[PDB]
Amino acid sequence: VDNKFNKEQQNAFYEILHLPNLNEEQRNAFIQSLKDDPSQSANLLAEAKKLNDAQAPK
């Protein structure tokens, strides 16, 4: 994105797009959240990361 978001948000976005033990509802709320407030992306990353890892297989 050249006029939409920044790399920090798109790198985080891809990071989220790569979560294998995530769900649509979560991946959606996150992606959307990222699309809403790109500034707090790193937060949605660490959050989607903690969630994906926390909600993953034992």
Side-chain angles (χ1 to χ4, degrees):
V1 282
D2 191 42
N3 241 76
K4 315 216 190 299
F5 301 147
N6 224 302
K7 52 107 89 267
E8 57 142 75
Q9 178 275 346
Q10 275 215 330
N11 191 335
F13 197 109
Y14 274 112
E15 245 257 273
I16 269 145
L17 267 183
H18 195 62
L19 330 139
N21 30 74
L22 220 107
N23 209 344
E24 215 183 38
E25 183 86 57
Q26 293 132 221
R27 184 156 73 161
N28 267 312
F30 276 123
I31 294 160
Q32 197 76 23
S33 196
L34 221 73
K35 217 125 178 107
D36 273 316
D37 198 62
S39 81
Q40 293 277 310
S41 295
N43 193 76
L44 336 187
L45 210 51
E47 267 306 284
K49 182 136 240 85
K50 230 101 219 164
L51 287 184
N52 206 54
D53 304 323
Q55 72 224 3
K58 65 94 254 131

